[PDB]
Symmetry: C3
Subunit: 33 residues, 3 copies
């Protein structure tokens, strides 16, 4: 159970990181995004 939850948490961390990059681009207007 713990090892499987470790994987789900890691997948969440990667998705959050990707969302953070997109939102920062939107709010700062990076490269005209």
């Amino acid at each position: 159970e713990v090892e499987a939850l470790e994987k789900k948490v890691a997948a969440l961390e990667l998705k959050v990181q990707a969302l953070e990059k997109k939102v920062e681009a939107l709010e700062h207007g990076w490269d005209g995004r």
Copy 2:
């Protein structure tokens, strides 16, 4: 503990999914969003 963490991770997965939909709409301009 594990069962409670399973619930918190599931709630995170749903919130991330909802954020992903909103951000994709913003960056692609879906339906004029």
Copy 3:
């Protein structure tokens, strides 16, 4: 392991909350954002 995963899940919850605030500001146009 469980205590460390509790911390990673809490960090995710805070990052998701912060993303939610930013995305809602972008989609509603709060304060001209």
